[PDB]
Paper text:
In order to gain insight into the functional differences of bacterial VTDs in comparison to their relatives from viruses and transposons, the structure of Wc-VTD1 was solved in the unbound form at 1.8 Å resolution as well as in a covalent complex with [name] at 1.9 Å resolution. The latter was achieved by reacting the protease with [name]-PA, which traps the Wc-VTD1 in an intermediate state with the [name] being bound to the S1 site in a covalent linkage to the active cysteine. Helix α9 (residues 474 to 486) and its preceding loop (residues 469 to 476) are pushed about 9 Å toward the active site by [name]’s loop consisting of residues 7 to 11, where it offers an interaction surface for the Ile-36 patch of the S1 [name]. The β-hairpin turn consisting of residues 421 to 423 is pushed away by about 2 Å from the active site cleft by [name]’s four very C-terminal residues. To compare the [name] interaction of Wc-VTD1 to viral VTDs, a superposition of the bacterial protease with M48 was created, yielding an RMSD of 1.76 Å over 1113 atoms. Wc-VTD1 does not contain the [name]-interacting β-hairpin of its viral relatives, but rather an irregular loop comprising residues 380–386 (colored yellow Fig. 5a). Three residues were chosen to investigate their importance for [name] recognition, based on their structural position: Phe384 located on the P383/F384 loop and Ala392 on the adjacent β2 strand both contact the Ile44 patch, while Leu481 is part of the mobile α9 helix and contacts the Ile36 patch of [name]. While the F384A and A392G mutants showed some residual activity, cleavage was completely abrogated by the L481A mutation, demonstrating the importance of the Ile36-patch recognition. Due to on the absence of a proximal [name] in the Wc-VTD1~Ub-PA complex structure, the mechanism of the K6-specificty remains elusive.
Author numbering:
A (entry chain B): 1 to 75
B (entry chain A): 280 to 354, 360 to 493
The structure:
């Protein structure tokens, strides 16, 4: 199924995922497209920052949902 | 005697450190000393009067901030720093009706949303005064002290051209102008979102004493 990720700086990316995919798997797919290390990705859905060990399903993220991505800035 | 006082924010709009010897450390975005020193600046400036903010006080921010940086390296947080070390307390502050925000995360935005953030921050409904914002991008940290009159002290550990460190007294329009010069819009062809986010977004933490 397809989901979308919108970055804070305005880009919308399309990912191919399965509900069983973990958040860490999703972050790795984002890294494959934009080079962002998973440990610095804040993925937001319905106002919660998603945890690496859970699955898209655990968060009831369905097809064509849009996640929101913020980079954890190091300074 | 007045003739024996250092220049301070009680009479000037910009005050500069004398000490430059820490600049290779403060300017190194591969280290987090710049953030440690911004946290020391919030600690020290939140309860200062304008006449106390002289070159000697900024020197003390650098000297004491580097000591705490070193102490942290041997052996509630902001970028992995324990705020207790700075006698600071974190206050919740985020863009609530915005899809990039989550409870407990810092305020996330871009240059286009910086003015809105400051409007919220400067509202004593949202945060008490004085309060400081510690604001980061991928390669720089600053501190914005919101003063009792609602104007600002901008502390920049990078200094002008990477040399020394300064504090500027700013109204809102001046602060926006300065942040656009320190956090400039950055672009080049092929830039990935790792760098777009790193250069063109910010996170801001609210702290008080």
């Amino acid at each position: 199924m397809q989901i979308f990720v919108k970055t804070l700086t305005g880009k919308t990316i399309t990912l191919e995922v399965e509900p069983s995919d973990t958040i860490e798997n999703v972050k790795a797919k984002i890294q494959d497209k934009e080079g962002i290390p998973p440990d610095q990705q804040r993925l937001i859905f319905a106002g919660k920052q998603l945890e690496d060990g859970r699955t898209l399903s655990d968060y009831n993220i369905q097809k064509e949902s849009t996640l929101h991505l913020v980079l954890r800035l190091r300074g | 005697m007045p003739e024996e006082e250092q220049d301070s924010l009680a009479a000037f709009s910009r005050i500069e450190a004398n000490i430059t010897q820490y600049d290779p450390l403060l300017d190194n975005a591969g280290k987090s000393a710049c953030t440690c020193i911004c946290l020391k600046a919030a600690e020290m400036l939140l309860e200062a009067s304008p006449d106390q903010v002289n070159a000697g006080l900024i020197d003390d921010i650098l000297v004491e901030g580097v000591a705490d940086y070193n102490r942290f390296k041997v052996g509630t947080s902001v970028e992995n720093y324990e705020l207790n070390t700075f006698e600071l307390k974190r206050l919740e502050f985020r863009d609530v009706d915005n899809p990039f925000s989550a409870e407990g995360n810092p305020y996330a935005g871009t240059l286009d949303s910086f003015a809105k953030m400051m409007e919220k921050a400067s509202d004593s409904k949202d945060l008490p005064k004085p309060v400081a914002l510690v604001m980061t991008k991928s390669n720089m940290t600053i501190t914005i002290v919101i003063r009792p009159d609602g104007k600002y002290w901008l502390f920049d550990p990078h200094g002008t051209n990477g040399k020394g460190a300064y504090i500027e007294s700013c109204n809102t329009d001046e602060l926006i102008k300065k942040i656009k010069e320190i956090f400039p819009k950055t672009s080049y062809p092929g830039m990935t979102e790792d760098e777009n986010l790193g250069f063109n977004s910010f996170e801001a933490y609210a702290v008080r004493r």
